[PDB]
């Protein structure tokens, strides 16, 4: 029907990708800590930091033989396009009934006397079974059995001392209601599935705030420069058009935040050049028409932007032929409120047809084209005012108007229960 | 003895440029008009403990004071640090240093003992804010010429990082060595920072302008309810 | 203060003087106008997030539905307010109108606007200065600053829509009926202008209040000297810092706090890993961000259906005061009223209307009696055996 | 159309509701009948349960929306209560309120979900030009006229 | 009555605003004493959510 109406975004648009990261020199020592036969025991763990490093995460999950393989903030196929700012790795040996406690959150006296990760955990955990070199009964492997109070999330504590419940004071000499912790492990080719040795290790890392410095084996791509893209700067993610900034940054600034904590500016991280970020879909499309009944002419107004910008903004460029007819024409009037395009400006002034905004009103009127023009407010008229003068009337009318008023609307009622959960009885 | 902070501490929590916001954080600050200690080494240096972090701030004349030990047992039992300069680069050493009871210069001190690794770089007000979470080790400045007869200004100062090290050292005292010429085997400012609720001021270029602490007064309150300046 | 009445049983008080007293009240007409593209605010250009909002149905339809209403309403609001008559009256170039002196409420030439003085000091009253997401989006007027600002695609979809009418055309408005008013009275509002001299029409507003009409003849210059003196004491109190303009900048503060709530809330997490929806997206494969999605989606529609709902609620408070508005133009400025206090304070003479952003000030010309005295009374007169009664 | 509005309105409104039943919220499929028969109570509770929830916020945007409508509503029939007692049942002096021009008279008639007022007045026409006067003086004496 | 229906209806919607703390929603019980004795705060957070 006849009237302005503000359409949805079905424009069709495709998009290509680009990577982009810095140039980290060496690749990562993980021939260390995956093949070193000289492992620890739980009471007492290693902690290896990991930086400048160019680690192919995908031949180890793929390329190896692993028992569990539990990826806790990250997933693993998503950790060869990201950078981690900072790594750590904790290598042990314990029993495999006990690697479901290698997990936040857990309980257990290997989780609850040895190893805490904490609650919000972002990293991965790996495991696979040993039945030759820490089993023979081999005999090089601790785990505390007694301790005051539980641990604190990612600490070690080594300290021998005797633990002591009752009313005895055993201080460096053993007795009643007083034990010694570190019993060790009894590892032997005796056995089946459950009291076997077991590798694990832990790794942690974070992604929130950092320059980048351990990174995955991915090669960067060009800067294609005012197109909507998939960017990817460090690992920060997005889509859109990529339109070359002037901004004052500090040394130390990285990327740029608006209120919503939303990314809006970025650097790049090999040419150090501040390029600013924007969105693309332009949803703010309305299309005036008359009915369907009369013609299948429209006009299209573009909200607030400039009659210039038109084709650069919509991405006319990639639009069906049947679009790009309004992005650009004969028929163009920039308003002030926004390019009206496909409706062309007269010099007349008449009542208010389809108001557009700001003052501009649209009506189909003689072909048949749809015009727009300036609305007037009624006609110009004097009286004739003297200090002495006045007028009179000589006849009169009677008049009947009309006026309608609504008073009631319809009484509705719904039953709760049948429109919920409609004649059934689990619900 | 004791004198007056007014607003004097204030550093940059991130490496995110915002412009014209008025943004709300909540980190570890030097609470405004608190009680700081202001020492001079006539007759000296005692040892002073390491809560949750030290704002540092000293009058400078001609290059005295040069660096900080970070203690903790200081038999050389347990790791400490050392952060000192000699005007060519300055030297970070992460050693179990040879701690006699008091340092100097031979206007040289520089031991190896089991070194983790080792990093290689009343005129001027010359501030420091060093905070030491177990994971890394911050150290943010400031450079500003004071031209007032002894006390801190009352402008406002933004402190941008310097650098960052990867330590993982319980601190629980910190020390300072200052220049003397005599060389014996004997046998500035401090405060220290609180978790506080502060309102930034960014405008354009990215600059914080002014804050606001939450905790001082009721008025305080006011202003960083309304997320404003003016009530 | 107390106050005590001398009544007896045949004690009257009559008036000896009066004072023209002129007053101010503002009214708020219409509100500002909103629109909200809902998928850019909930799942903004991401094609994963789209396909999953698509399992909610139509709230973004339902959304967009209202948020139209609202903004249509207020055009309609305008309308019913200043668009009275559809003549357009010009004022005489001579103003000889017995002594009154209009010039501060009629339009000025020499300026742009279509404005007088006193329209001029309203429109600086009510600021935007410390109005945030408002303020800031009319700052896309950078007017070369930079060659492609589209400012729609800056504020996750939350956009402002321009009135109907404009400033100008509201003045013009409100020119017409001043100068309807000025050159022929009451006759204008029931069918055409009939011109009457101006001191003419104050005598026939002074025999509406129950005061013979020599009393305005014998007491014109006085008359006129003091309504010149209180419309320069109201020109004299709206030029000082005494802002006056409370109830108009009541709603456009309103509008800013609800619309920076709304910015506000896209930095909730709602129980997901993280606010931001490009790092749930490259941390995380399909089956598992599915999770984290939909916690975000849910809580962002929340606080989308919240902002609705209290504006539907405001914009019917806006619709009733704007009603209220359309009756005072019609029963102050376009006829004389005899209801007690609904055109000022005291027996009603006349109205003028003027424009304020988003709203109307009606000056209400009022007679105050002063300066009273003490009289026996009775009640009727006895002189032949007769009573007698007075006529009025 | 004022009468015709409303009547769209409410239709619109309860087809909007019906529609909303076939969205499934994140759960199998939107059909209760179909998750009750390929699923056992401990996993068929937790796609209920999104079901649920979808539909209790349907319900509950329709009768929050039927409030505010039916408050508009009730502020209508208040004005034509006013107009049935002040114009039909006397003269109003109000400008403008019964009608355009000078009240003489209203007759009401029933419409479906409202009323209509039919209002009488009088429209003066045919004017004229004449000189006038404020007063008359005669023997010294300024004379006023009565009415 | 027509003061009394104010009353009436405002202290009805206190009382409802005051049962609605007897419900669970689909939670395991109504009592945040009783769901972190019950539950390791791994999946004791989400009954609290
Ligand atoms: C007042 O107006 C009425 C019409 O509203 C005039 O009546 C008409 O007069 C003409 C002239 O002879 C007739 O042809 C029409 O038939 C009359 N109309 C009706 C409805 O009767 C009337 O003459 C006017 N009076 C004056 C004094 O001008
Ligand atoms: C960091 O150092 C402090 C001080 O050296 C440690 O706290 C004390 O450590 C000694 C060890 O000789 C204990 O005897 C004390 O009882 C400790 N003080 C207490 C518990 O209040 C602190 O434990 C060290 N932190 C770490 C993680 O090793
Ligand atoms: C009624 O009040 C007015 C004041 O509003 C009186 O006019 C004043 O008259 C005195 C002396 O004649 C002057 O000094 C004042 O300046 C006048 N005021 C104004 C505003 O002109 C008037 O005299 C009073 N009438 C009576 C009968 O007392
Ligand atoms: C009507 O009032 C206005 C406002 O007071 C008068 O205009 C001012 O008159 C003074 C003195 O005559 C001048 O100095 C100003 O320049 C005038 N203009 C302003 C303030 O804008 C005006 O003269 C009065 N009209 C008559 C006929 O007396
Ligand atoms: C009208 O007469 C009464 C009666 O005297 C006046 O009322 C008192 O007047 C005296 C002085 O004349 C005052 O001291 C009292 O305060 C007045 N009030 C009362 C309650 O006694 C009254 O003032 C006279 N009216 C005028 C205008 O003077
Ligand atoms: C080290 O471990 C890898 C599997 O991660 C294996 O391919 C390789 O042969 C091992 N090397 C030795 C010396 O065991
Ligand atoms: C990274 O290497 C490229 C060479 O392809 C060079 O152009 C760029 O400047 C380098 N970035 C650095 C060293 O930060
Ligand atoms: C559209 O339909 C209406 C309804 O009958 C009709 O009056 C109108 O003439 C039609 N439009 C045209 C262009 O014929
Ligand atoms: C649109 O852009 C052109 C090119 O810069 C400029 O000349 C024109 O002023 C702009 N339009 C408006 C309304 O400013
Ligand atoms: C409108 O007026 C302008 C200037 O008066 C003129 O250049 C233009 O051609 C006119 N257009 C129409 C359609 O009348
Ligand atoms: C700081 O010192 C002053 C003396 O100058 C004293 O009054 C005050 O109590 C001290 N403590 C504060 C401000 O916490
Ligand atoms: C280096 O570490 C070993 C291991 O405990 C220690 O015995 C040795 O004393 C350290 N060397 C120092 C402190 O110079
Ligand atoms: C921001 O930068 C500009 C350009 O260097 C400078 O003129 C301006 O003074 C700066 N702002 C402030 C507050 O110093
Ligand atoms: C009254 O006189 C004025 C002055 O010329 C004129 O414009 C107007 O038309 C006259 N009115 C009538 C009804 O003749």
């Given at each position: 029907?006849?009237?302005?109406?503000?359409?949805?975004?079905?424009?069709?648009?495709?998009?290509?990708?680009?990577?982009?990261?810095?140039?980290?020199?060496?690749?990562?020592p993980?021939?260390?800590?995956?093949?070193?036969?000289?492992?620890?025991?739980?009471?007492?763990?290693?902690?290896?930091?990991?930086?400048?490093?160019?680690?192919?995460?995908?031949?180890?999950?793929?390329?190896?033989?692993?028992?569990?393989?539990?990826?806790?903030?990250?997933?693993?196929?998503?950790?060869?396009?990201?950078?981690?700012?900072?790594?750590?790795?904790?290598?042990?040996?314990?029993?495999?009934?006990?690697?479901?406690?290698?997990?936040?959150?857990?309980?257990?006296?290997?989780?609850?006397?040895?190893?805490?990760?904490?609650?919000?955990?972002?990293?991965?955990?790996?495991?696979?079974?040993?039945?030759?070199?820490?089993?023979?009964?081999?005999?090089?492997?601790?785990?505390?059995?007694?301790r005051?109070?539980?641990?604190?999330?990612?600490?070690?504590?080594?300290?021998?001392?005797?633990?002591?419940?009752?009313?005895?004071?055993?201080?460096?000499?053993?007795?009643?209601?007083?034990?010694?912790?570190?019993?060790?492990?009894?590892?032997?080719?005796?056995?089946?599935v459950?009291?076997?040795?077991?590798?694990?290790?832990?790794?942690?890392?974070?992604?929130?705030?950092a320059?980048?410095?351990?990174?995955?084996?991915?090669?960067?791509?060009?800067?294609?420069?005012?197109?909507?893209?998939?960017?990817?700067?460090?690992?920060?993610?997005?889509?859109?058009?990529?339109?070359?900034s002037?901004?004052?940054?500090?040394?130390?600034?990285?990327?740029?935040?608006?209120?919503?904590?939303?990314?809006?500016?970025?650097?790049?991280?090999?040419?150090?050049?501040?390029?600013?970020?924007?969105?693309?879909?332009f949803?703010?499309?309305?299309?005036?028409?008359?009915?369907?009944?009369?013609?299948?002419?429209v006009?299209?107004?573009?909200?607030?932007?400039?009659?210039?910008?038109?084709p650069?903004?919509?991405?006319?460029?990639?639009?069906?032929?049947?679009?790009?007819?309004?992005?650009?024409?004969?028929?163009?009037?920039?308003?002030?409120?926004?390019?009206?395009?496909?409706?062309?400006?007269?010099?007349?002034?008449?009542?208010?047809?389809?108001?557009?905004?700001?003052?501009?009103?649209?009506?189909?009127?003689?072909?048949?084209?749809?015009?727009?023009?300036?609305?007037?407010?009624?006609?110009?008229?004097?009286?004739?005012?003297?200090?002495?003068?006045?007028a009179?009337?000589?006849?009169?009318?009677?008049?009947?108007?009309?006026?309608?008023?609504?008073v009631?609307?319809?009484?509705?009622?719904?039953?709760?229960?049948?429109?919920?959960?409609?004649?059934?009885?689990?619900? | 003895?004791?004198?007056?902070?007014?607003?004097?501490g204030?550093?940059?929590?991130?490496?995110?440029?915002?412009?014209?916001?008025?943004?709300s954080?909540?980190?570890?600050?030097?609470?405004?008009?608190?009680?700081?200690?202001?020492?001079?080494?006539?007759?000296?240096?005692?040892?002073?403990?390491?809560?949750?972090?030290?704002?540092?701030?000293?009058?400078?004349?001609?290059?005295?004071?040069?660096?900080?030990?970070?203690?903790?047992?200081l038999?050389?039992?347990?790791?400490?640090?050392?952060?000192?300069?000699?005007?060519?680069?300055?030297?970070?050493?992460?050693?179990?240093?040879?701690?006699?009871?008091?340092?100097?210069?031979?206007?040289?001190?520089?031991?190896?003992?089991?070194?983790?690794?080792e990093?290689?770089?009343?005129?001027?007000?010359?501030?420091?804010?060093?905070?030491?979470?177990?994971?890394?080790?911050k150290?943010?400045?400031?450079?500003?010429?004071?031209?007032?007869?002894?006390?801190?200004?009352?402008?406002?100062?933004?402190?941008?990082?310097?650098?960052?090290?990867?330590?993982?050292?319980?601190?629980?005292?910190?020390?300072?060595?200052?220049?003397?010429?005599?060389?014996?085997?004997?046998?500035?400012?401090?405060?220290?920072?609180?978790?506080?609720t502060?309102?930034?001021?960014?405008?354009?270029?990215g600059?914080?302008?002014?804050?606001?602490?939450?905790?001082?007064?009721?008025?305080?309150?006011?202003?960083?309810?309304?997320?404003?300046?003016?009530? | 203060?107390?106050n005590?009445?001398?009544?007896?049983?045949?004690?009257?008080?009559?008036?000896?003087?009066?004072?023209?007293?002129?007053?101010?009240?503002?009214?708020?007409?219409?509100?500002?106008?909103?629109?909200?593209?809902?998928?850019?605010?909930?799942?903004?250009?991401?094609?994963?997030?789209?396909?999953?909002?698509?399992?909610?149905?139509?709230?973004?339809?339902?959304?967009?539905?209202?948020?139209?209403?609202?903004?249509?309403?207020?055009?309609?609001?305008?309308?019913?307010?200043?668009?009275?008559?559809?003549?357009?009256?010009?004022?005489?170039?001579?103003?000889?109108?017995?002594?009154?002196?209009?010039?501060?409420?009629?339009?000025?030439?020499?300026?742009?606007?279509?404005?007088?003085?006193?329209?001029?000091?309203?429109?600086?009253?009510?600021?935007?200065?410390?109005?945030?997401?408002?303020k800031?989006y009319?700052?896309?007027?950078?007017?070369?600053?930079?060659?492609?600002?589209?400012?729609?695609?800056?504020?996750n979809?939350?956009?402002?829509?321009?009135?109907?009418?404009?400033?100008?055309?509201?003045?013009?408005?409100?020119?017409?009926?001043?100068?309807?008013?000025?050159?022929?009275?009451?006759?204008?509002?029931?069918?055409?202008?009939?011109?009457?001299?101006?001191?003419?029409?104050?005598?026939?507003?002074?025999?509406?209040?129950?005061?013979?009409?020599?009393?305005?003849?014998?007491?014109?210059?006085?008359?006129?000297?003091?309504?010149?003196?209180?419309?320069?004491?109201?020109?004299?109190?709206?030029?000082?810092?005494?802002?006056?303009?409370?109830?108009?900048?009541?709603?456009?503060?309103?509008?800013?706090?609800?619309?920076?709530?709304?910015?506000?809330?896209?930095?909730?997490?709602?129980?997901?890993?993280?606010?931001?929806?490009?790092?749930?997206?490259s941390?995380?494969?399909?089956?598992?961000?599915?999770?984290?999605?939909?916690?975000l989606?849910?809580?962002?529609?929340?606080?989308?259906?919240?902002?609705?709902?209290?504006?539907?609620?405001?914009?019917?408070?806006?619709?009733?005061?704007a009603?209220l508005?359309?009756?005072?133009?019609?029963?102050?400025?376009?006829?004389?009223?005899?209801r007690?206090?609904?055109?000022?304070?005291?027996?009603?003479?006349?109205?003028?209307?003027?424009?304020?952003?988003?709203?109307?000030?009606?000056?209400?010309?009022?007679?105050?009696?002063?300066?009273?005295?003490?009289?026996?009374?009775?009640?009727?007169?006895?002189?032949?055996?007769?009573?007698?009664?007075?006529?009025?």
């Open positions: 029907e006849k009237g302005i109406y503000q359409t949805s975004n079905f424009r069709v648009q495709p998009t290509e990708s680009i990577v982009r990261f810095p140039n980290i020199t060496n690749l990562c993980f021939g260390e800590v995956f093949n070193a036969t000289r492992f620890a025991s739980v009471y007492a763990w290693n902690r290896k930091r990991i930086s400048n490093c160019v680690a192919d995460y995908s031949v180890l999950y793929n390329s190896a033989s692993f028992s569990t393989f539990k990826c806790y903030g990250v997933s693993p196929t998503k950790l060869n396009d990201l950078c981690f700012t900072n790594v750590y790795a904790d290598s042990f040996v314990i029993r495999g009934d006990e690697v479901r406690q290698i997990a936040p959150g857990q309980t257990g006296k290997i989780a609850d006397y040895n190893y805490k990760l904490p609650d919000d955990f972002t990293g991965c955990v790996i495991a696979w079974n040993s039945n030759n070199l820490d089993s023979k009964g081999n005999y090089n492997y601790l785990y505390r059995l007694f005051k109070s539980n641990l604190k999330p990612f600490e070690r504590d080594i300290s021998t001392e005797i633990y002591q419940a009752g009313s005895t004071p055993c201080n460096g000499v053993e007795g009643f209601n007083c034990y010694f912790p570190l019993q060790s492990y009894g590892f032997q080719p005796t056995n089946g459950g009291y076997q040795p077991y590798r694990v290790v832990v790794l942690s890392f974070e992604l929130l705030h320059p980048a410095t351990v990174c995955g084996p991915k090669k960067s791509t060009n800067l294609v420069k005012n197109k909507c893209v998939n960017f990817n700067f460090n690992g920060l993610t997005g889509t859109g058009v990529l339109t070359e002037n901004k004052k940054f500090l040394p130390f600034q990285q990327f740029g935040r608006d209120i919503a904590d939303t990314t809006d500016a970025v650097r790049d991280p090999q040419t150090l050049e501040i390029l600013d970020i924007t969105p693309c879909s949803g703010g499309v309305s299309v005036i028409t008359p009915g369907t009944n009369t013609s299948n002419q006009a299209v107004l573009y909200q607030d932007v400039n009659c210039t910008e038109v650069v903004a919509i991405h006319a460029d990639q639009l069906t032929p049947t679009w790009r007819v309004y992005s650009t024409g004969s028929n163009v009037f920039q308003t002030r409120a926004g390019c009206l395009i496909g409706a062309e400006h007269v010099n007349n002034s008449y009542e208010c047809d389809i108001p557009i905004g700001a003052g501009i009103c649209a009506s189909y009127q003689t072909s048949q084209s749809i015009i727009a023009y300036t609305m007037s407010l009624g006609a110009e008229n004097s009286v004739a005012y003297s200090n002495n003068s006045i009179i009337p000589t006849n009169f009318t009677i008049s009947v108007t009309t006026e309608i008023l609504p009631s609307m319809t009484k509705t009622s719904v039953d709760c229960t049948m429109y919920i959960c409609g004649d059934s009885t689990e619900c | 003895a004791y004198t007056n902070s007014f607003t004097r204030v550093y940059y929590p991130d490496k995110v440029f915002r412009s014209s916001v008025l943004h954080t909540q980190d570890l600050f030097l609470p405004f008009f608190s009680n700081v200690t202001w020492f001079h080494a006539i007759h000296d240096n005692p040892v002073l403990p390491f809560n949750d972090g030290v704002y540092f701030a000293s009058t400078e004349k001609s290059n005295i004071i040069r660096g900080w030990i970070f203690g903790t047992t038999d050389s039992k347990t790791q400490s640090l050392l952060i000192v300069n000699n005007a060519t680069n300055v030297v970070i050493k992460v050693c179990e240093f040879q701690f006699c009871n008091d340092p100097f210069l031979g206007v040289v001190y520089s031991s190896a003992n089991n070194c983790t690794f990093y290689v770089s009343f005129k001027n007000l010359r501030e420091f804010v060093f905070k030491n979470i177990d994971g890394y080790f150290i943010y400045s400031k450079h500003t010429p004071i031209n007032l007869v002894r006390d801190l200004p009352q402008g406002f100062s933004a402190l941008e990082p310097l650098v960052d090290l990867p330590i993982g050292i319980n601190i629980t005292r910190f020390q300072t060595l200052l220049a003397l010429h005599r060389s014996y085997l004997t046998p500035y400012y401090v405060g220290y920072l609180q978790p506080r502060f309102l930034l001021k960014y405008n354009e270029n600059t914080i302008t002014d804050a606001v602490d939450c905790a001082l007064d009721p008025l305080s309150e006011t202003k960083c309810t309304l997320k404003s300046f003016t009530v | 203060a107390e005590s009445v001398a009544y007896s049983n045949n004690s009257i008080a009559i008036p000896t003087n009066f004072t023209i007293s002129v007053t101010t009240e503002i009214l708020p007409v219409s509100m500002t106008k909103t629109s909200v593209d809902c998928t850019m605010y909930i799942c903004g250009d991401s094609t994963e997030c789209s396909n999953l909002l698509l399992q909610y149905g139509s709230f973004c339809t339902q959304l967009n539905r209202a948020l139209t209403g609202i903004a249509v309403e207020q055009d309609k609001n305008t309308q019913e307010v200043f668009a009275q008559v559809k003549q357009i009256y010009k004022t005489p170039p001579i103003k000889d109108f017995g002594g009154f002196n209009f010039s501060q409420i009629l339009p000025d030439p020499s300026k742009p606007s279509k404005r007088s003085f006193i329209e001029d000091l309203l429109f600086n009253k009510v600021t935007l200065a410390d109005a945030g997401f408002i800031q009319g700052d896309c007027l950078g007017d070369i600053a930079a060659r492609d600002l589209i400012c729609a695609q800056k504020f979809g939350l956009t402002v829509l321009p009135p109907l009418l404009t400033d100008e055309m509201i003045a013009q408005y409100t020119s017409a009926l001043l100068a309807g008013t000025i050159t022929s009275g009451w006759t204008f509002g029931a069918g055409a202008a009939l011109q009457i001299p101006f001191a003419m029409q104050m005598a026939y507003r002074f025999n509406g209040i129950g005061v013979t009409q020599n009393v305005l003849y014998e007491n014109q210059k006085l008359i006129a000297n003091q309504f010149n003196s209180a419309i320069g004491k109201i020109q004299d109190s709206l030029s000082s810092t005494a802002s006056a303009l409370g109830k108009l900048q009541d709603v456009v503060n309103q509008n800013a706090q609800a619309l920076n709530t709304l910015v506000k809330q896209l930095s909730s997490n709602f129980g997901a890993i993280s606010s931001v929806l490009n790092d749930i997206l941390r995380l494969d399909p089956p598992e961000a599915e999770v984290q999605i939909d916690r989606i849910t809580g962002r529609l929340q606080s989308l259906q919240t902002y609705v709902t209290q504006q539907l609620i405001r914009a019917a408070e806006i619709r009733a005061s009603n508005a359309a009756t005072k133009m019609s029963e102050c400025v376009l006829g004389q009223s005899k007690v206090d609904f055109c000022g304070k005291g027996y009603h003479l006349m109205s003028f209307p003027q424009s304020a952003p988003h709203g109307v000030v009606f000056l209400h010309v009022t007679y105050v009696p002063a300066q009273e005295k003490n009289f026996t009374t009775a009640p009727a007169i006895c002189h032949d055996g007769k009573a007698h009664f007075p006529r009025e």
